[model samples]
Target: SSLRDPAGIFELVEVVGNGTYGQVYKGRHVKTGQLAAIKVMDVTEIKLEINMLKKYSHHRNIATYYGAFIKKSDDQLWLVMEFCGAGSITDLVKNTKGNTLKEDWIAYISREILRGLAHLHIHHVIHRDIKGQNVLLTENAEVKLVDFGRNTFIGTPYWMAPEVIACDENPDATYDYRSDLWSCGITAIEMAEGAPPLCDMHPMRALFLIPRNPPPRLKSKKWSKKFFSFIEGCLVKNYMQRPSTEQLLKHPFIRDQPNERQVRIQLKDHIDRTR
Candidate 1:
């Protein structure tokens, strides 16, 4: 079903971001003054994303979908979703001057991201694109997974599991929920270090190295052992060897963090001041 608005139901304020398929616009519902994200894409590319959203929207950790419609002139389809004003975690990390996120804050954000992944896996959907740029933040600092464009049956090489990356000849390679867990580990490293683990190399070059390279490990061992263990569990070379989200959630690194909320709030305040 589509929303009815004769006099321009939603006001498009500005362009937020643009990608291959379409552009994301910051829109406001005319009557209620409520903010929304409107993703305008070609009709041909809308099926996979629209289907994924319809199937997974019920999950609390996933972004909420308002509705979808086809624009009258260009025939482009539009996806209306709940607006996450704080932007992506990648932006958040880049904004931090020292290029470091506090330990407690890392634990808090990582826990929520895993919780979301758990929910998605339970629902039988795989978030192929689970990088920091796709993880959005709400006004209250809660995380929501978004951007399902590259999410269709394909996986991003940078975050693909060793086995998946190694067996490129097989076009129909099926990956389980654990693939996302590996990405989660990569994201954890990104959050702490303020950049993707393979930021130094070209994307294709990094993809070639992921499987052949020694196991993924954090550059900084100065952090708590528990945190390093969590990273180790996620970056396991063998997909079958990785720990379940349930098991990872129970690890001391995720469970024993103290004063997490305060740290998050302080970091949020620091970001606000600097911005």
Candidate 2:
């Protein structure tokens, strides 16, 4: 029911960034000096992420959980995870001149995300948040899913599905894997464009627009035909008809990756050059 103190085992280093839950620090194992990403949280903030990681992080595409700790003195919780030195997809977009990734890179990243999502869905877990910011990368160009739970108001409504937005009105309603597929579509759009479909609009307005408007589409006509179809499949407004992860995995954009090897090399090169 409790965890050990982090004082002797781990050492917090520089501030990396923060997530929906808490402030994150670049940390290390005290004895071995192995690098770790440590999320230092207020007692109440640790509830959602800790157990989810322990149970569902075994898949290769999912982030590895190093451990969790508690400082008895202050009652703060420290959540240790793999150090994704390559940062997130959002960073990748920001670093590029046009703020967009190539089609192949988007395909590769999206496939990895769906793979991770598939693993979670198989276990009956829904990753409520699946956006560019939540998808992290390693030096090896490995894509991993992070930030398992919690949906802060402004941070996630832009990525939410029509059904999820509807749930806000009726608390008794429930959403499932299809909602994440909707987000997966939006994140793919995020990679193609600089931001999500309603980036210019306020979060509350975007929430109102999603269900009413037709599904969002890529602004540019240059994307591959398969890519366009893939986005269409993911963003189907009717959750009842939206394709499952298994079906999406078989979509041409995800299944037919002619340039996967090249994309991985390019992604790794970007990480090496940028970092």
Candidate 3:
């Protein structure tokens, strides 16, 4: 961050929300009037994202990286990104009556998440943080992965894979792509039940329990066999036992959907109504 040259391309507007890595401000391109989400953070985190997102930004499901800049007056790192006006999955569920989403709706969103995860895995990146907050949505309900924020402040403990937590137990406990599948299962639970398995418990306690307990299941039997099976496939206790993103993509709940196009339409309509 420097003040030698003027860095005045954007004007930070009102604060929108907080994200995994930094404060998210509703920003604008000073010359274009285009709205964007500008994140203010340390120079180091900005560097982390610049390296990681540059190669993956073209993917449809990941957040679009418009550019980066240094705050001229304050000497801060500014990350300019697309504004997902619809907000995150947690936002959608929070406003709902029971904090829960319908099974079919979960199916649609879950499939998109898997697609995102698969893309990251194929590209050799691991989205260590995979939770509702990091998954943002556009006005048209297009899902995008944000906050690929990492090891230094790994993730929200509840969404973390057991193997990730085990790293505390044994420093050599390594994480592979399979670790993300564990989080997808937790995200699916969040979609269906309105929260992760141990919402009633303390965050520290929940973190302690995740690696000890059996995988979580949907709260009721109202969901279909396929839905349960899909969750089951994701929640396998051992990463070695976990299914790959490609294999899970073929599961009936995800692969044999009635109409993906219609689901997107439904999602877009839902987002519009919410807005």
Candidate 4:
């Protein structure tokens, strides 16, 4: 259902983050006093982050929707969704001692990210952007997909799939669900090394290099073979040759290891310790 008046129900608490065009706020429902993330984008024209959010309600790792509201006489639209209190994967690395996560921790977070992606791909929506900044966690250590939309403006070039940029040169090049798999690979690198493959380069240069570059790998050979293989699976330069989200999920790195309770405790403990 659409909202008649979002301002009536929700109060903008503060700006939680900013993007290229607009702001994301921590909002509270005036009556219920519950919180939501209100992403405001100035629009000449636009569409759904929530209908996608609704289709994602069944998935544990997706940010749930609370509907949308058009304000400023429809010049702006507010995407009201659940608040992810623990911040993003980028923030996680920035806060960490060396900015890199343990390989096992990367494995765990990557699996959660994949699970969320699996759900979206299964439903036929491509996330397009799958950087550490778009993945968030909560106090309960619930990892979720956030900042989901079709806006290429919010996209970070470092995580762009080769095929997405390749489209300009070859009209045959098309955006596919598998493009996200490629980004998932880039994000895995981000988590393990605290940055993506071309972090040192300018965004425009990175865009050119990603399609021309060889598949990304961990900076050090110290990571497990299973872990390295998983990144390779996600970064295949050709989207047509890329593994499906489901196929990648079956990879040992995703299927293997830690107890659920223990992983949550470990994540929560990490969050608490850092706090």
The TM-score leader among the candidates is 2
Report the alpha-carbon TM-score of model 3 versus the true structure: 0.89
What's the lDDT of the predicted structure labeled candidate 2?
Answer: 0.87
Candidate 3 local lDDT, residue 82? 80
lDDT of every predicted structure (CA atoms)? 0.75, 0.87, 0.81, 0.81
Instruction: TM-score each candidate.
Output: 0.87, 0.92, 0.89, 0.90
Q: What are the RMSD figures for all models against the true structure? A: 3.2, 2.6, 2.9, 2.6
Q: Of models 1 and 4, which has the larger TM-score? A: 4
Better of 1 and 3 by lDDT: 3
Q: What's the number of clashes in each of the models?
A: 0, 0, 1, 0
Instruction: Give the alpha carbon lDDT tens digit for every residue of 52-146 in model 3.
Output: 67677667888888877765443567777887789899889887777788788899888888998898899888887889888888988888888
Clashing pairs in 4: none
Tens-digit lDDT track of model 2 for 1-275: 65788987999988866544358898999999888888887674354567767878998999889889888753788889888878888888989878998999999999999999999999998998889889999999999998775334446577888888654565554577889999999999999997999999988888789878999999999998999999999999888999999999999999999888889999999888877
Candidate numbers, best TM-score first, in rank order = 2, 4, 3, 1
